[PDB]
Design a protein around this ligand. Structure first.
Ligand SMILES: O=C(O)CCC(=O)C(=O)O
Ligand SMILES: [Cl-]
Ligand SMILES: [Zn+2]
Length: 275
Protein backbone atom coordinates (compact mmCIF):
# COMPACT_ATOMS: atom_id res chain seq x y z
CA UNK A 1 0.00 0.00 0.00
CA UNK A 2 2.92 2.42 0.72
CA UNK A 3 3.85 4.51 -2.35
CA UNK A 4 7.08 6.59 -2.66
CA UNK A 5 8.57 8.70 -5.49
CA UNK A 6 12.20 8.74 -6.70
CA UNK A 7 12.84 12.20 -8.19
CA UNK A 8 15.81 14.59 -8.57
CA UNK A 9 16.06 18.03 -6.83
CA UNK A 10 16.17 19.60 -10.34
CA UNK A 11 12.57 18.40 -11.01
CA UNK A 12 10.95 19.37 -7.62
CA UNK A 13 9.15 22.25 -9.47
CA UNK A 14 7.42 19.53 -11.56
CA UNK A 15 5.66 18.37 -8.32
CA UNK A 16 4.16 21.68 -6.92
CA UNK A 17 1.50 19.97 -4.72
CA UNK A 18 3.68 17.11 -3.37
CA UNK A 19 3.33 18.11 0.37
CA UNK A 20 -0.44 18.64 -0.21
CA UNK A 21 -0.76 15.14 -1.83
CA UNK A 22 0.95 13.33 1.08
CA UNK A 23 -0.74 15.15 4.02
CA UNK A 24 -4.25 15.96 2.66
CA UNK A 25 -4.92 13.81 -0.49
CA UNK A 26 -2.91 10.84 0.92
CA UNK A 27 -2.47 9.76 -2.77
CA UNK A 28 1.22 8.89 -2.09
CA UNK A 29 3.14 8.51 1.23
CA UNK A 30 6.82 9.36 0.68
CA UNK A 31 9.42 11.07 -1.47
CA UNK A 32 13.12 10.46 -2.09
CA UNK A 33 14.62 13.67 -3.56
CA UNK A 34 18.09 12.96 -5.02
CA UNK A 35 20.85 15.60 -4.96
CA UNK A 36 19.28 18.29 -2.72
CA UNK A 37 22.81 19.08 -1.38
CA UNK A 38 26.05 18.16 -3.25
CA UNK A 39 28.20 15.20 -2.02
CA UNK A 40 31.18 17.57 -1.33
CA UNK A 41 28.98 19.89 0.83
CA UNK A 42 27.86 16.78 2.81
CA UNK A 43 31.52 15.64 3.12
CA UNK A 44 32.65 19.13 4.31
CA UNK A 45 29.87 19.41 6.99
CA UNK A 46 30.60 15.82 8.20
CA UNK A 47 34.34 16.72 8.32
CA UNK A 48 33.54 19.94 10.32
CA UNK A 49 31.68 17.87 12.98
CA UNK A 50 34.23 15.03 13.45
CA UNK A 51 37.18 17.49 13.56
CA UNK A 52 35.48 19.95 15.94
CA UNK A 53 35.55 23.05 13.63
CA UNK A 54 31.73 22.94 13.80
CA UNK A 55 30.88 26.53 14.90
CA UNK A 56 30.18 25.33 18.45
CA UNK A 57 27.85 22.45 17.36
CA UNK A 58 29.60 20.03 19.81
CA UNK A 59 28.48 22.25 22.79
CA UNK A 60 24.83 21.22 22.13
CA UNK A 61 25.60 17.47 21.62
CA UNK A 62 23.21 15.20 23.55
CA UNK A 63 24.73 11.72 23.96
CA UNK A 64 21.30 10.38 25.19
CA UNK A 65 23.27 7.90 27.34
CA UNK A 66 20.26 7.66 29.77
CA UNK A 67 18.56 5.61 26.95
CA UNK A 68 19.78 2.40 25.24
CA UNK A 69 21.03 1.54 21.73
CA UNK A 70 17.48 2.33 20.39
CA UNK A 71 18.10 6.15 20.03
CA UNK A 72 20.57 8.45 18.23
CA UNK A 73 23.00 10.97 19.76
CA UNK A 74 21.66 14.38 18.78
CA UNK A 75 23.25 17.83 18.03
CA UNK A 76 20.73 20.26 19.54
CA UNK A 77 17.62 19.34 21.55
CA UNK A 78 14.83 17.77 19.49
CA UNK A 79 11.25 18.91 20.40
CA UNK A 80 10.46 15.19 21.18
CA UNK A 81 10.84 14.42 24.90
CA UNK A 82 11.54 18.03 25.95
CA UNK A 83 9.96 19.58 29.07
CA UNK A 84 6.91 21.85 28.32
CA UNK A 85 8.83 25.06 29.37
CA UNK A 86 11.24 24.67 26.33
CA UNK A 87 13.90 26.97 27.97
CA UNK A 88 16.81 24.56 27.13
CA UNK A 89 15.20 23.76 23.71
CA UNK A 90 15.05 27.40 22.52
CA UNK A 91 18.63 28.14 23.72
CA UNK A 92 20.05 25.11 21.79
CA UNK A 93 17.85 26.09 18.75
CA UNK A 94 19.70 29.47 18.45
CA UNK A 95 23.14 27.75 18.86
CA UNK A 96 22.11 25.15 16.21
CA UNK A 97 21.01 27.71 13.56
CA UNK A 98 24.28 29.67 13.83
CA UNK A 99 26.63 26.60 13.94
CA UNK A 100 24.70 24.93 11.05
CA UNK A 101 24.82 28.18 8.95
CA UNK A 102 28.61 28.38 9.59
CA UNK A 103 29.30 24.74 8.52
CA UNK A 104 27.27 24.89 5.24
CA UNK A 105 29.11 28.14 4.23
CA UNK A 106 26.21 29.01 1.88
CA UNK A 107 27.32 26.21 -0.51
CA UNK A 108 24.21 25.99 -0.33
CA UNK A 109 22.92 27.31 3.02
CA UNK A 110 20.97 24.48 4.74
CA UNK A 111 17.95 26.66 5.76
CA UNK A 112 17.40 28.41 2.41
CA UNK A 113 18.03 25.23 0.30
CA UNK A 114 15.50 23.10 2.23
CA UNK A 115 12.96 26.00 2.38
CA UNK A 116 13.23 26.40 -1.45
CA UNK A 117 12.54 22.60 -1.69
CA UNK A 118 9.43 22.66 0.61
CA UNK A 119 8.28 25.84 -1.25
CA UNK A 120 8.79 24.10 -4.63
CA UNK A 121 6.62 21.17 -3.43
CA UNK A 122 3.80 23.42 -2.04
CA UNK A 123 3.80 26.92 -3.60
CA UNK A 124 3.36 28.20 0.01
CA UNK A 125 5.88 30.22 2.12
CA UNK A 126 8.16 28.09 4.37
CA UNK A 127 9.02 29.23 7.92
CA UNK A 128 10.65 28.00 11.13
CA UNK A 129 7.95 28.38 13.89
CA UNK A 130 8.46 30.93 16.70
CA UNK A 131 7.90 30.39 20.43
CA UNK A 132 5.47 32.24 22.74
CA UNK A 133 8.05 34.99 23.52
CA UNK A 134 9.42 35.10 19.92
CA UNK A 135 12.14 32.46 20.43
CA UNK A 136 13.16 30.38 17.41
CA UNK A 137 12.43 26.64 17.16
CA UNK A 138 15.31 24.63 15.61
CA UNK A 139 14.84 24.00 11.81
CA UNK A 140 16.59 20.62 12.22
CA UNK A 141 18.93 18.55 14.48
CA UNK A 142 21.91 16.31 13.63
CA UNK A 143 21.36 12.64 14.49
CA UNK A 144 24.58 10.64 15.02
CA UNK A 145 24.04 6.89 14.92
CA UNK A 146 27.06 4.80 15.90
CA UNK A 147 27.76 1.09 15.32
CA UNK A 148 25.22 -1.17 17.05
CA UNK A 149 22.78 1.74 17.40
CA UNK A 150 19.38 2.19 15.79
CA UNK A 151 16.34 4.52 16.01
CA UNK A 152 13.55 2.39 17.61
CA UNK A 153 10.06 2.13 16.01
CA UNK A 154 7.80 5.20 16.59
CA UNK A 155 5.08 7.22 14.87
CA UNK A 156 5.33 11.03 14.43
CA UNK A 157 1.75 12.21 15.16
CA UNK A 158 2.18 10.93 18.77
CA UNK A 159 4.74 13.72 19.32
CA UNK A 160 2.22 16.58 18.75
CA UNK A 161 0.08 15.27 21.67
CA UNK A 162 3.11 15.46 24.10
CA UNK A 163 3.62 18.39 26.61
CA UNK A 164 6.63 19.79 24.62
CA UNK A 165 4.39 20.39 21.58
CA UNK A 166 1.75 22.37 23.63
CA UNK A 167 2.53 25.73 21.90
CA UNK A 168 3.49 24.31 18.44
CA UNK A 169 0.19 22.27 18.29
CA UNK A 170 -1.74 25.63 18.30
CA UNK A 171 0.29 26.87 15.22
CA UNK A 172 -0.38 23.78 13.09
CA UNK A 173 -3.32 22.41 11.07
CA UNK A 174 -5.21 19.32 12.29
CA UNK A 175 -3.39 16.99 9.81
CA UNK A 176 -0.42 14.53 9.42
CA UNK A 177 3.06 15.72 10.43
CA UNK A 178 5.62 14.94 7.72
CA UNK A 179 9.13 13.81 8.49
CA UNK A 180 12.31 14.81 6.61
CA UNK A 181 16.06 14.03 6.72
CA UNK A 182 19.18 14.30 4.54
CA UNK A 183 22.19 11.99 5.26
CA UNK A 184 25.57 13.70 5.78
CA UNK A 185 27.35 10.32 6.29
CA UNK A 186 25.89 6.90 5.31
CA UNK A 187 27.08 3.60 7.01
CA UNK A 188 28.82 0.55 5.35
CA UNK A 189 25.54 -1.43 5.91
CA UNK A 190 22.38 -0.99 8.02
CA UNK A 191 21.07 2.46 8.98
CA UNK A 192 18.05 1.97 6.69
CA UNK A 193 14.71 3.68 7.08
CA UNK A 194 12.13 0.91 7.42
CA UNK A 195 8.56 2.25 6.90
CA UNK A 196 5.59 0.04 7.91
CA UNK A 197 2.04 -0.01 6.43
CA UNK A 198 0.83 0.30 10.10
CA UNK A 199 -1.15 3.49 10.90
CA UNK A 200 -1.24 5.90 13.88
CA UNK A 201 -4.33 5.75 16.15
CA UNK A 202 -5.29 8.83 18.29
CA UNK A 203 -6.86 6.91 21.28
CA UNK A 204 -4.08 4.22 21.41
CA UNK A 205 8.22 10.12 28.94
CA UNK A 206 10.26 8.84 26.02
CA UNK A 207 11.51 5.68 27.87
CA UNK A 208 7.83 4.68 28.46
CA UNK A 209 6.81 5.62 24.83
CA UNK A 210 9.57 3.41 23.27
CA UNK A 211 8.47 0.38 25.41
CA UNK A 212 4.73 1.06 24.76
CA UNK A 213 5.08 1.34 20.92
CA UNK A 214 7.36 -1.78 20.68
CA UNK A 215 4.88 -3.97 22.69
CA UNK A 216 1.92 -2.87 20.49
CA UNK A 217 3.98 -3.10 17.25
CA UNK A 218 5.04 -6.67 18.33
CA UNK A 219 1.45 -8.05 17.98
CA UNK A 220 0.45 -6.26 14.72
CA UNK A 221 1.21 -7.65 11.21
CA UNK A 222 2.20 -5.12 8.44
CA UNK A 223 3.89 -4.58 5.00
CA UNK A 224 7.37 -2.95 5.01
CA UNK A 225 9.52 -0.85 2.64
CA UNK A 226 13.21 0.06 3.23
CA UNK A 227 15.07 3.20 2.11
CA UNK A 228 18.77 4.03 2.40
CA UNK A 229 19.15 7.56 0.84
CA UNK A 230 22.65 8.66 -0.08
CA UNK A 231 24.53 11.76 1.17
CA UNK A 232 22.67 14.88 -0.04
CA UNK A 233 19.35 13.08 -0.79
CA UNK A 234 16.19 14.15 1.03
CA UNK A 235 13.68 11.63 2.37
CA UNK A 236 10.34 13.43 2.91
CA UNK A 237 7.73 10.91 4.11
CA UNK A 238 4.48 10.63 6.15
CA UNK A 239 6.31 9.76 9.40
CA UNK A 240 3.32 11.14 11.32
CA UNK A 241 0.85 8.49 10.09
CA UNK A 242 3.17 5.51 9.47
CA UNK A 243 5.22 3.53 11.98
CA UNK A 244 8.89 3.68 10.96
CA UNK A 245 12.41 3.02 12.38
CA UNK A 246 16.14 3.15 11.47
CA UNK A 247 17.83 -0.26 11.41
CA UNK A 248 21.07 -1.06 13.31
CA UNK A 249 24.17 0.68 11.82
CA UNK A 250 26.62 -1.98 10.60
CA UNK A 251 30.34 -1.18 10.39
CA UNK A 252 32.67 1.41 11.98
CA UNK A 253 31.53 4.27 9.65
CA UNK A 254 28.68 6.14 11.56
CA UNK A 255 25.33 7.31 10.14
CA UNK A 256 24.87 11.12 10.34
CA UNK A 257 21.61 12.83 9.32
CA UNK A 258 20.26 16.39 9.41
CA UNK A 259 16.46 16.47 9.56
CA UNK A 260 13.18 17.04 11.35
CA UNK A 261 9.48 17.59 10.64
CA UNK A 262 7.10 19.72 8.60
CA UNK A 263 3.33 20.41 8.74
CA UNK A 264 0.83 22.98 7.45
CA UNK A 265 -0.08 26.12 9.47
CA UNK A 266 -3.63 26.40 11.03
CA UNK A 267 -5.12 28.08 7.89
CA UNK A 268 -3.06 25.79 5.48
CA UNK A 269 -1.57 29.02 3.96
CA UNK A 270 1.98 28.32 5.27
CA UNK A 271 4.52 25.46 5.79
CA UNK A 272 6.26 25.12 9.19
CA UNK A 273 9.43 23.03 9.56
CA UNK A 274 11.36 22.21 12.79
CA UNK A 275 12.89 19.35 14.83
O1 LIG B 1 17.26 9.19 10.41
C1 LIG B 1 16.81 10.24 10.89
O2 LIG B 1 17.36 11.36 10.83
C2 LIG B 1 15.48 10.15 11.63
C3 LIG B 1 14.59 9.09 10.96
C4 LIG B 1 13.19 9.17 11.56
O3 LIG B 1 12.81 8.39 12.42
C5 LIG B 1 12.30 10.30 11.05
O4 LIG B 1 12.73 11.09 10.18
O5 LIG B 1 11.15 10.42 11.50
CL1 LIG C 1 8.67 10.85 13.25
ZN1 LIG D 1 10.50 9.29 12.85
Amino acid sequence: ALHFLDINATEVKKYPTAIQDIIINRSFDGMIIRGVFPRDTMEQVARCLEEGNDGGMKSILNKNEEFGTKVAQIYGHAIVGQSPDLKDYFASSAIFRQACRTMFQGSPDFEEQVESIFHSLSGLPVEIPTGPEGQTYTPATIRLLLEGREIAVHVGNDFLLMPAANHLKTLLDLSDQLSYFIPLTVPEAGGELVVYNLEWNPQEDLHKYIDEVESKFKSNQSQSVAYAPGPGDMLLFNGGRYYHRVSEVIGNSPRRTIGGFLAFSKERNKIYYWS
